[PDB]
Amino acid sequence: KVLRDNIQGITKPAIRRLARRGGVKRISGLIYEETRGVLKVFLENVIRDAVTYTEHAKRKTVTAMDVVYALKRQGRTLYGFGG
Amino acid sequence: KVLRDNIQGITKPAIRRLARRGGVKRISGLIYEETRGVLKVFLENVIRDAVTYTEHAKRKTVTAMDVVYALKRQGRTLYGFGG
Amino acid sequence: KRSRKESYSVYVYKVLKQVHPDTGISSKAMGIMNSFVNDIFERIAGEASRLAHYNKRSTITSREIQTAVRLLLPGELAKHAVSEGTKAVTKYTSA
Amino acid sequence: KRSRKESYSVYVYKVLKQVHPDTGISSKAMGIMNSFVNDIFERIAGEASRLAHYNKRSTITSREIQTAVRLLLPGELAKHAVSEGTKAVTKYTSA
Amino acid sequence: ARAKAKTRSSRAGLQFPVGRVHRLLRKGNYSERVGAGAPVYLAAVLEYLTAEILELAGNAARDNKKTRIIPRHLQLAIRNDEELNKLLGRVTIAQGGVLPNIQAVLLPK
Amino acid sequence: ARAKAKTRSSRAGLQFPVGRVHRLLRKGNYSERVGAGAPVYLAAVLEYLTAEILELAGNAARDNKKTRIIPRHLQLAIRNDEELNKLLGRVTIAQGGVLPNIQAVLLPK
Amino acid sequence: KPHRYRPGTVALREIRRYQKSTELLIRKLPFQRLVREIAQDFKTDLRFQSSAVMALQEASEAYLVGLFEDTNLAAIHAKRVTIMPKDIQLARRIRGE
Amino acid sequence: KPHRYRPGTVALREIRRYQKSTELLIRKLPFQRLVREIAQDFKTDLRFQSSAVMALQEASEAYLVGLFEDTNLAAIHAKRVTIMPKDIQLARRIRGE
C-alpha cells in the first residue's frame, strides 16, 4: 500500500517512444531522469489541481472530469473525456 | 489623409533601445525589418479586435479600455489603464 | 433505473451524413466532437458575456456573438460563419 | 459634477498607511493597483464561478473561493491567504 | 385549440438545436438576458464549424480509404488547416497522435 | 428605532470593501446566488495580496531612497518575488520597465 | 555476417511508426502507480477512475510530445540533433514554466 | 587621440540604463501614425484617444521586450550573443504564435 520509487516506472524506452512520437532522432542519456522530473512536476501541478477539485467535490476518487478540467485551466485543453 | 509607410516610423534606434530594455547585447542587421513586420502582425491581431470592440460599441473613437481588453484577451494583460 | 446524460450525438451524426452520405464515425471521434462543440460554445459564450459586460449591456444578441466570432474565429472562417449566421437569422426572422 | 467613477483609491491608501507610515503613492501606481485588484478579482471570481458550475452549484461561498485560491495562488501565498481568509470569516461570523 | 409545435432548428433550417443552445446559454450564466437571434447565430456557427471539420475528416478518411472517421483522422484534419490550427493551437485530441511532421534536417542525405 | 449603520469590512476587521466586492460578484454575473462569507474571504485575499505587494513596494522605495511608490517600485516588487512572478507572468506593469537582469554570457570577463 | 542497420534509420522507422500509429506509449500500470504515488503525497487515501488514469496518460504523453517538439526545434536551432538538458530548460523557460 | 570605447561596453551601459530607466522607447507621434495606418486598413477615418495610443505603445514595447527576452535566451542557447531572425522565429514558434 506504500509507494516509494514509482518515478522509475516510466521506463527509459517509454521516454524513447514519447520522443519518437514527438519526432526525435537522438536522445541523450541525461534526458530520461530530468524528463521524469519535468513530468513529475507537471503531474504535481495537474494532480494538485485535481485533488483540490476532488476535495472541493467531497468525493474520494479522482475522476476524468477533474483531470480534463485541471488541464483545461492551464491552457492544456484535452478532448475526448466528456468535456 | 492616406498613410502609406509608417513601418519605417518605428526607427532602427527605437528597435535598438527596445532590445536594450530586452537585455539584448547585440542585434543583427536583419532584425529590424523583421521586428517591424512582427510588430505589424501583433498590431493586426490587437487593433483588428480593438476596432471590432469599437463598432461593437458603435463608437468612432478608439478608447484605451478597448486596447486593454484586446491585450488581455490575448493573455498579454496590461496594467495601468483600466477604469 | 438510470439518469439521462446529454450529448451532441444526433446533430453531429446528421451533419456527417449530410456532408458525406457514405462515411461513418467511431465512438471516440464522437466524444471528441462532443468536447469540441462544448469548448467552442463555452469560448463564444464567455467572450459574448465579456462584450456584454464591457459596454454595460445585460442582453446577448446575435450582434454580440457576431463580434465574438469575429474576435475568435481567424480569417476566412469568420466571414463564412458570418454568412451562415446571417442566413440563419434571416430564415428565423422570416419565419 | 459628473457620474462618479468608482475606484479602490482610499482603500489601498489605508493599506499603505497601515503597512508603511512614511511611504507615499503615485497616481499611476494607484492606477496599477486598480488594475491589480480588478485583475485578481476577475481571475478568482471567474474560476470560482466555473467551480460553482462544475458541481452544479447555484451558490458561490467561501469554500469555492478558498479552493480557487488553492488553484490560482501558489504555495505559501495560497496557504497564508487561506489563513487570513479564515480569520476574516471567523471575525465576520462573530461580528 | 393550439398550434403544432415546430422547432426553431427547423425554422432556421439548421440541424443544431436552437432550443438546447439557448438553454445552455441561459444556464451557463453569461448574461441576465439573451436575445432570440443569438442562439440561432451561435448554432449556425457551430454547425458550420462541425460541417467543415467533418468534411476534412471524411476526406482524410477516404484518403486513408476508411469509411469511418477516427480520432487519428481528426488530428490529421485539424493540423492540416492553418485556421483550424489557429483555433485549436493549445487543444489536445485524445488518441489521435500527431500530424506526421519530420524536420528537414532529420531526413537522411 | 433603526440600528447604527456599521460596515462589514470593520465587522470583519478589514479595509477592503466587503460590500463592493459582494456587489461586483452580483453584477459580474458569476452565479445566481453568492454565499455571505465569499466576499469577506475575497476581500481578505485581495487585502493580503495588496498588503504584501505594497510592503515590498515601500521596501523597494526605501531601498531607492524615495518616499513615494513609483510604478518602477511595483515592477521591481513583482519580479523579485518568484511566487508573485508566477502569479503575474503574463501581466505587464505600465511604466515599470523590466527587472534588471543580464545573462552572464553577455557580461565581460 | 549478420545484418545490422546503421545508427538512425531504426529511429526514423520508429518516427514513422509512432507518428503514423496512435496508441499509448507509457506502460499503463507503472504510470498508474506513479500517479497514485504522487496523489498519495497530497491528500491521503485516493482512488482513481480508470478513465482518469488514461486521461492523465493521454495528457502526459501529449505534453511530453509538445516538449520534445520544442526541444527538437531547440536542438536544430543549436545545429544539433541530439537534445540536451538545456534544451528542455529553454523550452520550459520560453513557454514560461 | 580622441577617446574611444570598445564595442558592447556602451551597449552594456545602455542595457543597465534601460532596465534602470522606465520611460517609453518608441517615439509617440510616429507610433500614432502607425496605429492610424493600421486602423484605416480596417475602418477608415478612425479617431484615437491619446491614452489609447499610449496604451498601445506600452503594450507594443512590452510585447517586443518580452520577445527579445525570449530571443536573447534563444541566442545564448545557440552559443551566440547576437540575435538572428531564426532566433525570433524560434521564440515566436515555441511561444505558440
Short mmCIF file of C-alpha atoms in Angstrom, two decimals, chain A residues 63-73 76-83, chain C residues 35, chain G residues 55:
data_model
loop_
_atom_site.label_atom_id
_atom_site.label_comp_id
_atom_site.label_asym_id
_atom_site.label_seq_id
_atom_site.Cartn_x
_atom_site.Cartn_y
_atom_site.Cartn_z
CA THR A 63 -12.34 11.33 -11.94
CA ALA A 64 -11.59 12.05 -15.58
CA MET A 65 -13.63 15.25 -15.35
CA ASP A 66 -11.27 16.65 -12.70
CA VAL A 67 -8.31 15.67 -14.90
CA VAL A 68 -9.62 17.30 -18.07
CA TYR A 69 -10.74 20.38 -16.15
CA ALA A 70 -7.34 20.86 -14.49
CA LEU A 71 -5.72 20.51 -17.90
CA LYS A 72 -8.29 22.99 -19.26
CA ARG A 73 -7.40 25.72 -16.76
CA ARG A 76 -3.67 22.36 -21.99
CA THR A 77 -7.19 21.58 -23.16
CA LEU A 78 -7.98 17.90 -23.70
CA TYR A 79 -10.74 16.49 -25.87
CA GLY A 80 -12.35 13.08 -25.68
CA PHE A 81 -13.18 12.70 -21.98
CA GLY A 82 -16.66 14.13 -21.66
CA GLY A 83 -15.74 17.82 -21.54
CA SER C 35 -15.77 18.01 -26.43
CA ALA G 55 -6.77 10.74 -19.24
#
